[PDB]
Amino acid sequence: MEDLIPLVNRLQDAFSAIGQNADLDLPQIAVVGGQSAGKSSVLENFVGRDFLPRGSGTRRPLVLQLVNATTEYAEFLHCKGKKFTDFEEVRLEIEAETDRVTKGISPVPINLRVYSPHVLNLTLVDLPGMTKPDIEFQIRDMLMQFVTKENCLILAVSPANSDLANSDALKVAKEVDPQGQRTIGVITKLDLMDEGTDARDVLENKLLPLRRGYIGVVNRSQKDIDGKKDITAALAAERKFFLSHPSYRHLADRMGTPYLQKVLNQQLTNHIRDTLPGLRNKLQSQLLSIEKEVEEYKNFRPDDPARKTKALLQMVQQFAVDFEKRIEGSGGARINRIFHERFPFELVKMEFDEKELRREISYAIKPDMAFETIVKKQVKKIREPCLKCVDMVISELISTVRQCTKKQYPRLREEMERIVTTHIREREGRTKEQVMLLIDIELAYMNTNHEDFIGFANAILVIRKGWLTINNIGISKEYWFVLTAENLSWYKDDEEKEKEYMLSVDNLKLRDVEKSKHIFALFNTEQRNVYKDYRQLELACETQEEVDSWKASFLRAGVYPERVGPQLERQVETIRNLVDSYMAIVNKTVRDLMPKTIMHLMINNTKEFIFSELLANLYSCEESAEQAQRRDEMLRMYHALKEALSIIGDIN
């Protein structure tokens, strides 16, 4: 159809206008240059004028458009201006255009066209030929880009002068077109081959044939009085060379520029007719995919404040629900609870027994007054554990906002981080101050009419999993330990499908060993052996934290750490009961009161604040530059692609 070839030209010109043209699935001829070639002569001959850059140069993907005319001349798309009448100017222009967008390559197409009553109607797409190599590698990926397309035909150009078993043209062609679905194949410089190198078989198409087939041509090196080559001498010479050759006189009808021109035409046309429909579909599909992002744009215009207000309503309001949310969902939900119900370990840790406790009794002696000295100094030691807890909350919390501050804008996310992240720092002080008071309270009264007794009265929940290298089996690899609040067990693979053993949490106690690895062990209070024939189970971990975290996640399982167990014997006899009674109750309080406090201040202060005072603060006081490029690319893709199909017509 006379409108088939001319049609695809409109696409390229329009799409090429914005340069994203490898990507569009477009039916076109993909000239591939291999080795010495030269592919360019094969082009300059179709017109009868040498315009392509002289020498190897093979510049950038260049879209050549041979549109049959009555007069010889050409004009590029960038100028949109003059019509070149001096083909020598083209060369000068093309080369200039190249360096502007670049030794340098670029997939951006030139998209040139040429009106001439000499050139047969064809559009030839020319790509940089092979060489002989970083440049080369760089080169090849883009070439792969083009041939790889479903609907791109490669006119693999191979010089007969050399071995064809290894031709840059066909070689690369076999990669993207193992058959002859698109590859055609051209044979140049028969004259180069040595007195005997002639190989008709290949034009015969053997070793190996393309569905498209092979064609032969010879570029006359003859020069006119002018520098530019003359058409007849070259043309007539072809029909001469062939007809005056034994193994080619019978192929001459099919050998030469004249045939190749005709071939490429009715071959490129038989392509557009079958494929155009696929294009319509594959083109209309990539359109909606864009409209699915334009609907997100809301108003397709810049810029409206109403949109900013909507952002404030959603950008800064969903973040409110994004929080209670994150808090209650390890995630912040239990990373959080953990610290409240693991905290009691920090207490036990920063507390004492045995002789340290006993020495204090001796100091008190040298009963009620003694009790005050003991506790008033013990409760004083609760500051250490308490203060640490507060800080622990901030960590998992201050970083929590960040776990949902990415879900884009550089101005807004950073602002949100500064406004919230700092607020907690202001309150970490407030709360920490409230903590001291609560403690100082104890050193003030310590009633005994409490539930405690008066002096002289006597006398399936899986706690945590993880790996933990066992220790010193001498015959020592780690295992997937999954201690629960009911029974500890360690398996082999995180799969947990090969249970190694199961120790009864009952009658177990944890004690540190030595103290450059952080090692701790577990021993049974009843059975001389913990597990198997081992006196104690020694578990090693990488850092002190892992230990602290594990032991904390152990007491909650019932595995307390292990504490050894004149008339001074009767004296401390009662005292022992005293310290225990009160300390026991005072502990129950804090382990409950501390968590409660924070929730009011750290949590509620923040929750409340971020809920409404945040937006107000934002009122009181974008790109995505990278993303902005896409929208410009997006905004341009639409305006371009619409013309693509608005021109294709409708099922022709």
Q: Which stretch binds a copy of itself (CB under 8 A): 87-95, 107-115, 186-194, 333-341?
A: 333-341
Using rule CB under 8 A, residue 442 touches a copy of itself: yes
Please tell me whether 440 is known to bind a ligand. Answer: no
Tell me if 603 contacts a copy of itself by CB under 8 A: yes
516 annotated ligand binder: no
Instruction: Report the C-alpha gap between 447 and 120 in whole angstroms.
Output: 110
The response to whether 168 counts as a known ligand-binding position is no
Q: Which residues between 336 and 355 bind a copy of itself (CB under 8 A)?
A: 337, 340-341
Residue 487: CB minimum distance to a copy of itself, A: 20
Interface of this chain with a copy of itself, residues 530 to 569, rule: CB under 8 A = none
**Does 461 sit near a copy of itself (CB under 8 A)?**
no
300 touches a copy of itself by CB under 8 A:
no
Cis peptide before 483 (omega within 30 of 0): no
Q: Which range in 233-241, 305-313, 585-593, 638-646 contacts a copy of itself by CB under 8 A?
A: 585-593
3-class secondary structure, 66 = strand
Cis peptide before 303 (omega within 30 of 0): yes
Chain breaks in the chain (C to N over 2.5 A) after: 57, 102, 132, 329, 366, 407, 459, 475, 515, 565, 621
Q: Is 221 annotated as a binding residue?
A: no
Amino acid type, 644: A
- Is 38 annotated to bind ligand? yes
Taking CB under 8 A as the rule, does residue 437 contact a copy of itself? Answer: yes
Q: How far apart are CA 353 and CA 376, in angstroms?
A: 16
CB 170, CB 156: distance < 8 Å: yes
Cβ closer to a copy of itself: 262 or 430? Answer: 430
Whether residue 88 contacts residue 65, with contact meaning beta carbons closer than 8 Å, is answered with no
Site residue total, a copy of itself (CB under 8 A):
29
Between CA 304 and CA 297 the distance in angstroms is 12
Tell me: does residue 596 bind a copy of itself (CB under 8 A).
Answer: yes
| Choice between 119 and 598, CB closer to a copy of itself | 598
Q: How far is CA 390 from CA 434, 553, 609, in A?
A: 11, 18, 19
**Distance in Å, CB of 556 to a copy of itself, minimum:** 9
Q: Under the criterion CB under 8 A, does residue 604 sit at the interface with a copy of itself?
A: yes
Confirm if 297 and 310 have CB atoms less than 8 A apart: no
Least spacing, CB of residue 473 vs a copy of itself, in Å: 37
Minimum CB distance to a copy of itself smaller for 503 or for 590? 590
Residue 589 sits in the site that holds a copy of itself (CB under 8 A)? yes
Shortest separation between residue 434's beta carbon and a copy of itself, angstroms: 7
Q: With b meaning 16 or more CB within 10 Å and e meaning fewer, what string describes 397-419?
A: bbebbeeebeeeeeebbebbeeb
Distance CA 542, CA 548 (A): 12
SS3 at position 514:
coil
219 is in an annotated binding site: yes
Known binder of ligand: residue 265? no
Of these, 485, 599, 635, 645, which contacts a copy of itself (CB under 8 A)? 599
Which span (20-28, 238-246, 485-493, 593-601) binds a copy of itself, by CB under 8 A? 593-601
**Does 451 sit near a copy of itself (CB under 8 A)?**
yes
Q: Answer left, alpha or beta for residue 128, where phi above 0 means left and psi between -120 and 50 means alpha.
A: beta
Distance CA 539, CA 56 (A): 71
Helix-then-strand count for the chain, H and E: 20, 16
Binding site for a copy of itself (CB under 8 A): 337, 340-341, 434, 437, 440-447, 449-451, 585, 588-589, 592-593, 595-600, 603-604
